[PDB]
Design a protein around this nucleic acid. Sequence first.
DNA 1: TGTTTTTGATAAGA
DNA 2: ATCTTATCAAAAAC
Length: 47
Amino acid sequence: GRPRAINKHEQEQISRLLEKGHPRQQLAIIFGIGVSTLYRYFPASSI
DNA sequence: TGTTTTTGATAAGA
DNA sequence: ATCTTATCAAAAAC
């Protein structure tokens, strides 16, 4: 199968950053993954 | 060349 | 312009 873009570690962190107000576009770029992926891992309707 | 799993563009959104 | 969501083709792995 294909590996995940972010490990469970990165998920807790990104989750945090997102709650702290970091723009998904910025996080995408930095972690080198796609904005759509972030919206999947963390629905807007969940922050 | 083949399956699986997850990625990421993308279109649509009373 | 923005933001979000689910879809779906295919990249990534083996």
